[PDB]
Design a protein around this nucleic acid. Structure first.
Lengths: 112, 206
RNA sequence: CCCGCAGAAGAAGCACCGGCUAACUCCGUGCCAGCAGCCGCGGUAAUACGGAGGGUGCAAGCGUUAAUCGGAAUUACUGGGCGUAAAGCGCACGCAGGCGGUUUGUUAAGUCAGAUGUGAAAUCCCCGGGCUCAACCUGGGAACUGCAUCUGAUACUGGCAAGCUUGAGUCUCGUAGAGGGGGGUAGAAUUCCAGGUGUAGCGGUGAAAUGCGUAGAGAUCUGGAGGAAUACCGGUGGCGAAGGCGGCCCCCUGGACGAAGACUGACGCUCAGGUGCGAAAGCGUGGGGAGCAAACAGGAUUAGAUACCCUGGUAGUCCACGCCGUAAACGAUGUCGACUUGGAGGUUGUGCCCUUGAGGCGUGGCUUCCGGAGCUAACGCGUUAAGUCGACCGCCUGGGGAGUACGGCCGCAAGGUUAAAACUCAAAUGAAUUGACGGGGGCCCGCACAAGCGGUGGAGCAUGUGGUUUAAUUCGAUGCAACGCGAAGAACCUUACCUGGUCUUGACAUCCACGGAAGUUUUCAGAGAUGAGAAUGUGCCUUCGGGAACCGUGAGACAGGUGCUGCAUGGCUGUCGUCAGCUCGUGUUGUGAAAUGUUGGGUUAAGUCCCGCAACGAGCGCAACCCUUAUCCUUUGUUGCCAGCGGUCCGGCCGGGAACUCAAAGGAGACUGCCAGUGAUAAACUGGAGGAAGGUGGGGAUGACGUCAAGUCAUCAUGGCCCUUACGACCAGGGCUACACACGUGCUACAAUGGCGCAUACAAAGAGAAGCGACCUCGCGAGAGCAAGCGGACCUCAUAAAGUGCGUCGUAGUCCGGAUUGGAGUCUGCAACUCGACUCCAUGAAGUCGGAAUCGCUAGUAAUCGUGGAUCAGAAUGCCACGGUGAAUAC
């Protein structure tokens, strides 16, 4: 957050472009990692996960906490780490498009 | 052992000297004895006064005693009586008039010399060292110090075999000359021989 | 039993106190005395030994010993185990024994219910009662866990009878196979024998030797003789109970498994004793004997080599018939049966769809690997289980003694099988974890080796050390990381050591009582310390019964100790190592010690940087920040400088000038910043441009967590213990420098790129006031006299040396080398003998490039020349800085 300020309006030339670049590429590092989560600042209450193969890591962690999870599990996935299982494809490109939008609408209205 | 005195290495660059004056090569010797002598005396009288460092400046044969202290009340006594009492002998040791000038310290627990005294103080009164030692460390963080490090050695806790247990909280970059590190040392005379205390403070950064 | 009397008067020890285990300190003694159930305590600071105090436990008893049980689920019926900790017979068949599918009837043995007879009293238990309560005595009941009889019950097990078929078994048609025994047989090769060809080696090894060979080998060709084993195929492929089993063909023969049904009708599973089979080696009788090969021999290797290596070689290994009966005979896993997710394979049958095309769809037998649940100490096992259960059998009960002795049995023998005890110890042992280490593997670095240059070790001298000697040769350092070290400098001093002479509240500090200014001056005895006087002065404030001072005497606390232990310690230091590593927070996996992060791919000087990722971060380190050096601009212009301009004894010397040198401050500049290429479009690496300087530009400073219980108690500080008319203090002389001897670190040499004489050229840095000292005079000289200037860019120390031109000696122990020695001397210091440096004349040794061995060095470095400084009166070839000259090589 601080750097996000330091980047668009903050310090960018105080020392030298070479290291000013350092913070920028560092900003990129935190970017791809905590980009779309920075505003949360607490603990979530639902984990919607696309694949259970690559992301069993988080599922177990979420399961370890008092939190429910929703996984689009696949033939080679362990449903026993999930709460509300969703069988079907996970890795198919078009598959998620159908999936997320369906979730997108339900979550869009779900604040009623 | 292995490390250089933190104070000494940063003298020329950051930390100023303590006996600031001038003298040609001839008289150099005598001043050292004299300047040292008063320093010994102040330790002997203002011990129960929490005195951190004592500046000894000598412009035009005028022995100036600037004392960076903690408790002015104890130092001045009443209306300054104690100070002007000290004025007499000090002027006598240095052989010339002495304007004794005090300097109160901002935070008594942020000066290395003073804190080391506290660690020594409790060990000079049967205090379990770990509690005594750690108490100071929490204080540095509780006073905002960027970092602190402490270290004791000897027959600590009455033990026969001597061991050296240190502690650390906060960033203490000793290899960075740019940063000011108030380092100081004190002894600890217990029935179990002498205990030595060392304390570092990453007070300054530049 | 009750009553009266008398004064709290008669009436509490024992063990323990480190932990287990409640309860602590001090002193004494020091691996002695001792203690103790165990682990363990005692080494000069003991909570564990002895005493004292306090205290914890129990109580007229309290500790010790012994003995039974408990804890010991370490004999497991309740209630254990056997893959690797102790423990599956080597495998198998199989009598007794144990257990046994399913349907129905039947009987009522075992089992169950009830009743009955009995199960001695006491004891125990339950509720009561009686002795002041209790112990104790005692009433009634329960119980006596059992056994016998009688009558009912009939599920489960047993006996009997009759079946059923899903267990087991038989037959028919086929299949694969190193299944077993017997009889023939094929080719390659080795060895030997007989010739032909042909000639100095062959063979063997790390090298070599023994050995074979000019009587002619080896090599090569042809013929023959034999013995043993079966290349390729060949496959965590197949068969077998196990051991095992391998070219091909034939004979006799076992077993396994499959399709489809037929048939018998529980005929089973296991199995003590018993019987059989059972690798290799070994044994007996008779054959065979190529190759290989115990034993043995020779030859090497080696300190030795009864071995590892080489040349040969007997028994044996091969066949026949008997014996032996053991293997890490091992998936270290008994046999049989049932049930419980999956995946990839191999192999052998067989039904079906298309064989429509090396196929697709299913069902069986054996076998390989990976892993789920679960199990397990963990490793791992995992439908072929160590998972969940059932039947039966073997076996274990700490290690060692010992799978041994004794005896039995068996054996031709060697031995085998069965199988202890006394005694001894407090562990043994398994799995896994962190490290350390490997004459283990991979990756990388360093004057680590290599490529070179120059050195030490041989000589002389200097200095240090060991040893020796001595009255004393002070004490410490004493693998690397002690040995030109503490000591940045011993004649007296220093000085701690010795002899002799002296004082002992002292050399020094504070408080007390009293007297005396302090101090200066002078003399005697003494080695000196000091002992003895003689004089002078009699000074600051007046409580003036005294200050404050410095000195003297006496008393008492003490002062003092370079006395011991750096293994009681702080502080300070070296080294591993300027090596790039060392860790923590939170989380996460693991029963846990811990691991992860810190690993992996690239990269770098570097856990430096990027990417990857159950890790995300962070700290300490690396780097940078600091100083110096390489370039420039700006500013100032002395005691520093001299270009463009004048005067000159052409000396920056005098005006004058502020350019330049230089000096001193402030900044600029260098950061992979730019280009091309490679590389993951990443980090980074290679080359180039410009630039004074190029990949942290050179150098220095900087020393992580910790290691060596490394150095230091003698620089200092300091706990203990010790001396204290002494180990403390003063003094003169000596010693620390002694010298059959050994080692270290250096300087000078051994010469001609060299010596000597004459002239001459080019530095930087630093020091200087009881200090340096020109100029001038004297001397051959070290120095002496007088002595401006300078406490300092001016003055002085102070004339740079190598080098350069010329002359010259001409390979000698010399015109080299310079020790040693005599004499004459100067300076310093009270003092130069033990024991100073330097000069002059004379003297003139060892030594001609140094054994085994071994050190430093990657560029202005090695080497080589000279210079200055700290210590200090005097006393450098040491140490610390400076500048000149200027290499070699890095595959």
């Amino acid at each position: 957050k601080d750097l996000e300020t330091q980047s668009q309006d903050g310090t960018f030339d105080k020392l030298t472009k070479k290291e000013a670049l350092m913070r920028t590429r560092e900003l990129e590092k935190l970017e791809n990692s905590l980009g779309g989560i920075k505003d949360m600042g607490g603990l979530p209450d639902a984990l919607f996960v696309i694949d259970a193969d690559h992301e069993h890591i988080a599922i177990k962690e979420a399961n370890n906490l008092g939190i429910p999870v929703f996984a689009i599990v696949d033939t080679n996935s362990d449903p026993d780490g999930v709460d509300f299982v969703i069988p079907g494809n996970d890795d198919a490109i078009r598959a998620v498009t159908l999936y997320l939008g369906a979730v997108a609408a339900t979550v869009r209205e779900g604040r009623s | 052992g292995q490390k250089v005195h933190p104070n000494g290495i940063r003298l020329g660059i950051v930390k100023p000297w303590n006996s600031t004056w001038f003298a040609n090569t001839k008289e150099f010797a005598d001043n050292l004895d004299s300047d040292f002598k008063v320093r010994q005396y102040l330790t002997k009288e203002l011990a129960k006064a929490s005195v951190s460092r004592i500046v000894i400046e000598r412009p035009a044969k005028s022995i100036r005693v600037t004392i960076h202290t903690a408790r002015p009340g104890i130092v001045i006594g009443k209306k300054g009586e104690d100070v002007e009492k000290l004025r007499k002998v000090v002027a006598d040791i240095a052989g010339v008039p002495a304007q004794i000038n005090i300097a109160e310290v901002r935070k008594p627990e942020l000066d290395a010399k003073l804190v080391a005294d506290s660690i020594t103080s409790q060990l000079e009164r049967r205090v379990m060292f770990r509690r005594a030692m750690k108490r100071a460390v929490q204080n540095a963080m509780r006073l905002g110090a960027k970092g602190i490090k402490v270290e004791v050695s000897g027959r600590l806790g009455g033990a026969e075999i001597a061991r050296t247990e240190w502690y650390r909280e906060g960033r203490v970059p000793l290899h960075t000359l740019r940063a000011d590190i108030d380092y100081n040392t004190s002894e600890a005379h217990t029935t179990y021989g002498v205990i030595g205390v060392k304390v570092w403070i990453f007070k300054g950064e530049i």
